[PDB]
Design an enzyme around this catalytic site. Structure first.
Site, PDB file in Angstrom:
ATOM      1  N   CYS A   1      43.058  33.037  51.648  1.00  0.00           N
ATOM      2  CA  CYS A   1      42.346  32.232  50.673  1.00  0.00           C
ATOM      3  C   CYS A   1      41.763  30.986  51.324  1.00  0.00           C
ATOM      4  O   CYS A   1      42.367  30.376  52.216  1.00  0.00           O
ATOM      5  CB  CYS A   1      43.278  31.861  49.528  1.00  0.00           C
TER       6      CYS A   1
ATOM      7  N   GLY B   1      47.262  34.927  52.885  1.00  0.00           N
ATOM      8  CA  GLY B   1      46.994  33.733  53.662  1.00  0.00           C
ATOM      9  C   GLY B   1      45.533  33.447  53.891  1.00  0.00           C
ATOM     10  O   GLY B   1      45.205  32.380  54.421  1.00  0.00           O
TER      11      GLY B   1
ATOM     12  N   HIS C   1      43.789  26.889  43.337  1.00  0.00           N
ATOM     13  CA  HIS C   1      45.074  27.543  43.098  1.00  0.00           C
ATOM     14  C   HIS C   1      46.126  27.178  44.134  1.00  0.00           C
ATOM     15  O   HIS C   1      47.290  27.533  43.959  1.00  0.00           O
ATOM     16  CB  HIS C   1      44.950  29.058  42.880  1.00  0.00           C
TER      17      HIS C   1
HETATM   18  O1  LQL Z   1      44.659  37.586  44.411  1.00  0.00           O
HETATM   19  C1  LQL Z   1      45.696  36.930  44.461  1.00  0.00           C
HETATM   20  N1  LQL Z   1      46.678  37.014  43.556  1.00  0.00           N
HETATM   21  C2  LQL Z   1      46.508  37.727  42.315  1.00  0.00           C
HETATM   22  C3  LQL Z   1      46.084  36.772  41.243  1.00  0.00           C
HETATM   23  C4  LQL Z   1      46.871  35.939  40.467  1.00  0.00           C
HETATM   24  C5  LQL Z   1      46.084  35.129  39.614  1.00  0.00           C
HETATM   25  C6  LQL Z   1      44.763  35.356  39.755  1.00  0.00           C
HETATM   26  S1  LQL Z   1      44.439  36.550  40.908  1.00  0.00           S
HETATM   27  C7  LQL Z   1      45.960  36.000  45.640  1.00  0.00           C
HETATM   28  C8  LQL Z   1      46.635  36.848  46.722  1.00  0.00           C
HETATM   29  N2  LQL Z   1      46.901  36.006  47.880  1.00  0.00           N
HETATM   30  C9  LQL Z   1      46.377  36.137  49.111  1.00  0.00           C
HETATM   31  O2  LQL Z   1      46.580  35.312  49.984  1.00  0.00           O
HETATM   32  C10 LQL Z   1      45.469  37.297  49.384  1.00  0.00           C
HETATM   33  C11 LQL Z   1      45.942  38.586  49.582  1.00  0.00           C
HETATM   34  C12 LQL Z   1      45.054  39.593  49.920  1.00  0.00           C
HETATM   35  C13 LQL Z   1      43.719  39.277  50.045  1.00  0.00           C
HETATM   36  N3  LQL Z   1      43.233  38.044  49.832  1.00  0.00           N
HETATM   37  C14 LQL Z   1      44.109  37.084  49.509  1.00  0.00           C
HETATM   38  C15 LQL Z   1      47.761  34.878  47.539  1.00  0.00           C
HETATM   39  C16 LQL Z   1      47.106  34.048  46.468  1.00  0.00           C
HETATM   40  N4  LQL Z   1      46.799  34.854  45.283  1.00  0.00           N
HETATM   41  C17 LQL Z   1      46.414  34.090  44.165  1.00  0.00           C
HETATM   42  C18 LQL Z   1      47.356  33.322  43.506  1.00  0.00           C
HETATM   43  C19 LQL Z   1      46.998  32.566  42.405  1.00  0.00           C
HETATM   44  C20 LQL Z   1      45.688  32.575  41.955  1.00  0.00           C
HETATM   45 CL1  LQL Z   1      45.298  31.675  40.528  1.00  0.00          CL
HETATM   46  C21 LQL Z   1      44.731  33.321  42.618  1.00  0.00           C
HETATM   47 CL2  LQL Z   1      43.057  33.289  42.104  1.00  0.00          CL
HETATM   48  C22 LQL Z   1      45.077  34.088  43.719  1.00  0.00           C
END
Ligand code: LQL
Length: 301
Positions: free
Chosen positions: A145, A143, A41
């Protein structure tokens, strides 16, 4: 004596963490040999989120679009490929700090250490369990991930988790290092939510043994139960079934304490039915399920 949430020493993993930037997104990668692994992602944009086609998104990238930094040293990306939900960025330099390692997918109920990282820099280390519902109750901020979970056996790091997302309830989901998600979660925008969870019975029993080894005995009783009758109670309190294999796995702890497993099961049944009446076990007022039998042996001799 004593019993703590104890993680593995993180040095061998610290030396593998790098920063990966694509466009305006920065997250963490894992640098082993001449490959950096990170969540795919990283190539998403704000407009891609409903149904990204990652194959299209990646075809449109060049090596020069990935900025990889190992501390103050920039690594040149010379190839890029997708493996399931991770990206593999081939770099021109093998990591000199690469430990002996394996990629190993864990089972629900297993534990691992997490090295939370931001901008490629390690921030802290804690112990986690893979829940029955394939989430982890982590501690992660924006941040984080690409942070990884691992166990260490002798000199060998067994990587088992890479962090991808936070779910609406505040728990976390991610993949193995082959890029395959734990559980029914996806790296696209949906209403996905953690499913119903259960308590890891074999781990509770292991922790009761830890308590006995550490001098907490108030919950012990003279009774024994059958595995069938115990499992009837387990079901009623949303505990996982206890199998004969679990009983066998607890053998060493049963031998060290002289308390048969089905005897300990009778204690657990009474704690589930009556509570603790204001007492504590190993400093907790609730039944703790995130220590495995191995974790207990490792810390209690
Ligand atoms: O869970 C997220 N977003 C909701 C979603 C949107 C789509 C699927 S879940 C994370 C949150 N983010 C963090 O850094 C974070 C914050 C707190 C704790 N651990 C991480 C930034 C990235 N963001 C993300 C973006 C695109 C994709 Cl595709 C995915 Cl898997 C993840």
């Amino acid at each position: 004596s004593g019993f703590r949430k104890m993680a593995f020493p993180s040095g061998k993993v610290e030396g593998c963490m790098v920063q990966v930037t694509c466009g305006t997104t920065t997250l963490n990668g894992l640098w082993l040999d001449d490959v950096v692994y990170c969540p795919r992602h990283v190539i998403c944009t704000s407009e891609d989120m409903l149904n990204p086609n990652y194959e299209d998104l990646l075809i449109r990238k060049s090596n020069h679009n990935f900025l990889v930094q190992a501390g103050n040293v920039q690594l040149r990306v010379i190839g890029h490929s997708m493996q399931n939900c991770v990206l593999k960025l081939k770099v021109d330099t093998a990591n000199p700090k690469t430990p002996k390692y394996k990629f190993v997918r864990i089972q629900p109920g297993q534990t691992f250490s997490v090295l939370a990282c931001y901008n490629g820099s390690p921030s802290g280390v804690y112990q986690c369990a893979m829940r029955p519902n394939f989430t982890i109750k982590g501690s992660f901020l924006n941040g984080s991930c690409g942070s990884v979970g691992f166990n260490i056996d002798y000199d060998c790091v067994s990587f088992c988790y890479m962090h991808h997302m936070e779910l609406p309830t505040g728990v976390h989901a991610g993949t193995d290092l082959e890029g395959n998600f734990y559980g029914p979660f996806v790296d696209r925008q949906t209403a996905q939510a953690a499913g119903t969870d259960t308590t890891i019975t074999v781990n509770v029993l292991a922790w009761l043994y830890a308590a006995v080894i550490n001098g907490d005995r108030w919950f012990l009783n003279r009774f024994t139960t059958t595995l069938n009758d115990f499992n009837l109670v387990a079901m009623k309190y949303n505990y996982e079934p206890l199998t004969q294999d679990h009983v066998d796995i607890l053998g060493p702890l049963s031998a060290q304490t002289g308390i048969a497993v089905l005897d300990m099961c009778a204690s657990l049944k009474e704690l589930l039915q009556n509570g603790m009446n204001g007492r504590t076990i190993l400093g907790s007022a609730l039944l703790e399920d995130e220590f495995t039998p191995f974790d207990v042996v490792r810390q209690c001799s």
